[PDB]
Amino acid sequence: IQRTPKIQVYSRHPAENGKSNFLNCYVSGFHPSDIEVDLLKNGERIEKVEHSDLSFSKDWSFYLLYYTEFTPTEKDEYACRVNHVTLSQPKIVKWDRDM
């Protein structure tokens, strides 16, 4: 009856410092559709995050792309933070230039 989101944090284009880009968190495979998704910069909730229109796959599970315009730097750390009725606490996944 319930399904836990898979989670991916990545960038739209390959990351280059001082180069404008978008940070993405993609949540999929989940049910019900109520879901909290936050992008973090150095542990702080980023303010202007948008998401795609809710849609779903053949198994009826839901998927959304949350994203935010951003300029990566050598020292800035990014993560995705997700919560959902299936998670007894929020999940954080870090952005890793190579994942």
């Binding site: 978008f22 019900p32 559709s33 849609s55 779903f56 994942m99």
Partner: protein, 275 residues
Amino acid sequence: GSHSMRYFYTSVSRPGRGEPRFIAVGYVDDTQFVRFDSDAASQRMEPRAPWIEQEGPEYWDQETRNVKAQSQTDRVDLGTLRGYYNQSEDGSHTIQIMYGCDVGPDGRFLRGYRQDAYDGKDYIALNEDLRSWTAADMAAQITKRKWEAAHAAEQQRAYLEGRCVEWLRRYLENGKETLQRTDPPKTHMTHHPISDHEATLRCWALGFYPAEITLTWQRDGEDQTQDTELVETRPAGDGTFQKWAAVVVPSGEEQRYTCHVQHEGLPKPLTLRWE
């Protein structure tokens, strides 16, 4: 050169707040082109791809009324199904609806679909013949009886074989520049040591459309599958997709491995090597 149109509806009841949240999206293949969201200010079907904006206000007017009426029907069906399942007005429930048509390379009808779900499980579906319905459980059987006695399948079929296919063809024409493209994947490979005698090889495909793709690891020419870690194909956010696949190798054995990459935009499969 097959193409498909698909529409997705989701209605979620909001006990203790008000009317259900109702969200509609439309795709041609892997490309989104319209949306309706009951919360949003506009109360209109709204364009989501450059090539559907050339439709005149009369299209938007009709799409917006039709989608609204779908919304109301779904709102009432949530009530009925709550009854059917002895559920309560304090609980939130979900109805999902998926439908559309496939055409072949020539533009002509192959296949039509429509299926409905309740709380993320199968509820009722139109069969292949487009003339009959499968019900997943006892409650859906009550629905199936009503639909048989209303001759609903007949109206489904007439849309799926008629208007679904016509508008799909039109959209393939008006949007040929994006929709008929095949962006081959940009690929490369990475290498992280993880012990003294062990490293990860990760194979990447970026920038491709359509989303359908295969990535495969080989060791001396033979397909692995046992130690391939591989993520779901994910959207990039500009209408293209990404995906990767990794394998943990003994350190020093790196040139034994190859990643094979299949995509409709590639004349021939690619072979990647850590070289």
